[PDB]
């Protein structure tokens, strides 16, 4: 359940 | 329960991006399942 990041930054 | 995939994850941010993670294989998705 945890939220990860936009792939790309 | 079938036109969203189950593996997958709604990242849907409020920037205008909608990415979709497989939190199966820990996949980053730009694609909508349903698109390809």
Same mark, same amino acid.
């Given at each position: 359940? =945890?939220? @990860?990041?936009? @792939?790309?930054? | 329960?079938? @036109?969203?995939?189950?593996?997958?994850?709604? +990242?849907? =941010? $409020? $920037?205008?991006?909608?990415?979709?993670?497989?939190?199966?294989?820990? !996949? !980053? !998705?730009?694609?909508? @399942?349903?698109? +390809?």
């Amino acid at each position: 359940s =945890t939220y @990860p990041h936009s @792939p790309t930054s | 329960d079938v @036109p969203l995939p189950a593996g997958w994850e709604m +990242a849907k =941010t $409020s $920037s205008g991006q909608r990415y979709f993670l497989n939190h199966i294989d820990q !996949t !980053t !998705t730009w694609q909508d @399942p349903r698109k +390809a």
